[PDB]
Amino acid sequence: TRDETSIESFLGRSGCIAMIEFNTSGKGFKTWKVSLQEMAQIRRKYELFTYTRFDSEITIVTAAAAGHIVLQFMYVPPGAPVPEKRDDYTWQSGTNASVFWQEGQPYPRFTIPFMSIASAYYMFYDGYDGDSAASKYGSVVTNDMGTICVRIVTSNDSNIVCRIYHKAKHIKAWCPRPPRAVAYQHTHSTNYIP
Amino acid sequence: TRDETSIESFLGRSGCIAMIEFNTSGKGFKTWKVSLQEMAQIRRKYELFTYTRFDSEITIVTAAAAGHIVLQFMYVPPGAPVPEKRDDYTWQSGTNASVFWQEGQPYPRFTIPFMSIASAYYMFYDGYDGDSAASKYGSVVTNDMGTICVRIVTSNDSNIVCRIYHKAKHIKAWCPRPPRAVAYQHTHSTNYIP
Amino acid sequence: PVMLTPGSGQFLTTDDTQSPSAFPYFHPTKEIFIPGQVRNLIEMCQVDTLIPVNNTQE
Amino acid sequence: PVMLTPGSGQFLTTDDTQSPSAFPYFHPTKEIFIPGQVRNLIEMCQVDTLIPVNNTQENVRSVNMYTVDLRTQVDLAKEVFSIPVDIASQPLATTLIGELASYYTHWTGSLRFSFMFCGSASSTLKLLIAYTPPGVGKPKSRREAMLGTHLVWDVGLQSTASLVVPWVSASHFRFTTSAGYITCWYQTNFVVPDSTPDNAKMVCMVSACKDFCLRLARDTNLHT
Amino acid sequence: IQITRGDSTITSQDTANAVVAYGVWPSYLTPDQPDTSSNRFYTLDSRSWTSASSGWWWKLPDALKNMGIFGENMFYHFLGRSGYTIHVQCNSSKFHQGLLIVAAIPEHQLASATSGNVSVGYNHTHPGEQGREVVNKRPSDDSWLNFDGTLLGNLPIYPHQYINLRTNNSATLILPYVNAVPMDSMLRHNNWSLVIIPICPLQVQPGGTQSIPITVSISPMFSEFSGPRS
Amino acid sequence: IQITRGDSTITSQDTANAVVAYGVWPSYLTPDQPDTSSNRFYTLDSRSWTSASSGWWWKLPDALKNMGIFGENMFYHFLGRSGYTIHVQCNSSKFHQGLLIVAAIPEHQLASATSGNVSVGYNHTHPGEQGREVVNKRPSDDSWLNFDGTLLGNLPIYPHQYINLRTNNSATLILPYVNAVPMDSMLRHNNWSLVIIPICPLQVQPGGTQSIPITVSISPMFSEFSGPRS
């Protein structure tokens, strides 16, 4: 009994953390910097803790509307260069992880390791990127988790939507915190005023 | 010999307990509250007993008519919020079980555990939801089994029919009852008058 | 190295495969003792029930 | 020679298969010791957190929601406070245990309620703290509360009192959306010497006991 | 012989010939209790069985809600649990004849006397110690359909005994607690219904007593309650 | 009794009743150190608690950056690490009343007093030994929202003690080093915030002292530094 209140049960359930959409007719690619802060319901559960550490399993559910479409999904790890164009050199780099997926095949899945240079992710961070009045404060300073990039490989009028399902695995969590009592206004910020 | 009259043999055969249908052109989703009372032939066999306990295996046979369609089938457990709209927050909740299925793939299958807060389902219940003259009587009071929800994930004129096949598993049954002698009039009710 | 065989991907309605639990981590409510468990219908067949011998329209 | 079976190629969102590492050869940063690891949420439920008992429109934007007034200038026949014991509803719903229970459909086990008197060392008073079981109906008077399960608490002698409400329902769990009432009554007037405040505040707290359990997780708009 | 429970005593020689429902003796709840002050025989007002009678029913614990310590315990606790001994006696001459089935039905969810999806109302399903003597939210009168759409000839699948007036003047049912939860609301829900139906109607010649009394005595057994209140 | 660390001495009988944050005693970093010249008690200027007070906070190590050898070590090394003993004393008569919560919050990332995505500025999050006494880049004043959008009634989830003026005049927190890296910039980042909030406001009758002093004494514990420079 009480395994359903284990941290693996509470934080380790798959959820749609991002919603990549793009069109084709540059243009035919999209990118998303990976964070758990986008969706309030996911964010609130992770923010019950000060630090968390997990590997993460990505599953990408794709729907498309105008032969079968071919997509490249690319994971760019922290501090590596992110694509600027649909056929940039970054898509060919053997240091990025790519999965090529073709329509009607089972949805693509991969696990990213815990990538951070610190031993856990900071859900909160009481410090700065530097000394300046312009310097960032809070959990945006730490926690580059990488970027998910999508392009169509096929030659040509179509709309593509990719739901990024994420499951945290082998989860550890430290220093419990009061639950968020008021609405989230912005990503990584503790600000609450409407 | 006589395993074919075991309760697992008698109650544990797969049958089409529900027939979800919807159209797309809100609108592009449908829901069905799970019960064994919809189909008289299924209902009569379970109502030979006062209490039953089982896990249940759901298999969803889908046909559709105007690329390959993508559907999300979602199990909402007892007491969780059911979808009000095609892109409501409830479809993204990691506490619901979802299977994404795409046309021509083998039909989706999952087992729901025995979900009830009581130790068995009440086939009959000689009691009320409360003290009032408006209070419900009978096996509708107990036995929320959850809700099956369906939406199209694809962007756009189509008609979809989903046959919900259900097999009870690891079945236990208690307190045998006379067979139903007269027609069923309504779900959960013992009423018989035309 | 595998070959699928002609039964592959069928939904045979009488099949008996394993399937994934929709809800791992969930523990079902404990099975208490309830009197009068039935394991086989032949237990019910062994009970004496009245024959409606006097079948007339009145 | 294999057959795929009807589950094959599904994305069931609750599945637990292996999957390929996107980055073999990469070794993650070593896990150092960090104080305060949490392994189960029931560790957090066991912490005493303040009940916002004083829910009135003047107090709910402030620290004053947590403090119950005790005073000389009062109708001594009226209740001091009452708390419904269901963690599903006000005032318990925004406590840490009410918040953690809101992520689950079902709860069970014992609740510890604690009361702390914050008057001066020269202030003395008796309070009657009563528990009324579910379905019995909230006491209308100090005499009716005294005929039930109660503590006569002398706040002069003891600055803290506690009550453990054990699990009492027909099923081993109940839904997170009665458990009875805790009610507080004046047993005496508020007694002070000269040059002492003729009023004080009391703080109410709640936590789980070691038997507490939550079941069937759910996500819902109880936070937007 | 004599049977005594609490300060109550009843006389019957048949007591060893009781039917134990499902072969399970009543018991206190296992680790995974007021005794004899609660667990008396309460004897209801006797029914008049006549050649015109369609049968009778009572719901348990509802028939005992006004009955002494047990009836008070049903209001003064949130949840409860009990088994029962039901003793039915039916005194007659050697010149009377008739057959009763005495049956206990678990979860006897009544059908209405009406064609809609309308439920049976709380006032009708909770008749108390008087029961219902069978003649828009009222229950079925069809004793031949067990008031629930099932045939009377199949009623013996439930815990039952016959009273055949030539053979035996009494029946005894021992009922364990039967529910899908360990304890439940004694006022919102009835675990058992006692049903008494004449299969062969009473016959006697004129100058014999035209009504014979059916006397029902019910004792709670292993009664347990939780959530006490004053 | 008397507590002595380095050339500093403080008096309090309550010292054995300290809360050890997360049950972990402070320690030197394991193989997978200036001692008592650094590890003195530094006593801050006492706060005036009044019936009007909303509470106070300090950030650590920031509150010690000007404090003797430890404050110099924060500028003369690139990376640092320490635990703390925080001793809070609050001297009062038997005729005063009030309740403080004294809490230590790890990574207390402040919300702004404003509606935009605008961060709290470095000048505001690094107040030094004076702390902030609570009243467009300034932090929240909502002590009832923990300055971070979380309820004050839930603040006890952090390492904390109460000061209830009738019972105890003091609180002691022992804080281990808490971070996701072994050592960090002592000037860019604060491991802990000390928060003192009146739950029950101060009351005393006229002719009593209307302000009571809250005295905060902080000792570094097991302090370690790396990358030394002159």
Author numbering:
A (entry chain A), B (entry chain A): 64 to 88, 98 to 138, 144 to 233, 237 to 274
C (entry chain C): 3 to 60
D (entry chain C): 3 to 179, 185 to 231
E (entry chain B), F (entry chain B): 14 to 45, 55 to 157, 165 to 259
Quoted passage from the original study:
Rhinoviruses (RVs) are the main cause of the common cold. Belonging to the large family Picornaviridae, the typical architecture of RVs comprises a ~ 30 nm diameter capsid enclosing a ss(+) RNA genome of about 7200 bases. The building blocks are four capsid proteins (VPs) present as 60 copies each and arranged on a pseudo T = 3 lattice. After the first 3Dstructures of RV-B146 as well as of the closely related poliovirus type 17 had been solved, high-resolution X-ray and cryo-electron microscopy (cryo-EM) structures of numerous RV types and of closely related members of the Enterovirus genus became available and have been used for the design of capsid-binding compounds. These drug candidates attach inside a hydrophobic pocket mainly contributed by amino acid residues of VP1 and displace a natural pocket factor—in most cases a myristate—stabilizing the viral shell against structural changes required for release of the viral RNA genome into the host cell’s cytosol for infection.
During 2D classification of the extracted particle images we also noted that about 20% of the particles represented empty capsids. Following the infection and virus purification protocol, we usually found empty particles in the range of a low two-digit percentage of total viral particles. For completeness, we also analyzed the structure of the reconstructed empty capsid (the B particle); it also exhibits an empty and collapsed hydrophobic pocket missing the myristate; similarly to the native empty structure, residue VP1-Met222 reaches into the pocket. This agrees with previously published structural data of uncoated particles. Finally, based upon our structural data we conclude that incubation of RV-A89 with DMSO elutes the myristate from the hydrophobic pocket and renders the conformation of the pocket more like the pocket of the uncoated virion.
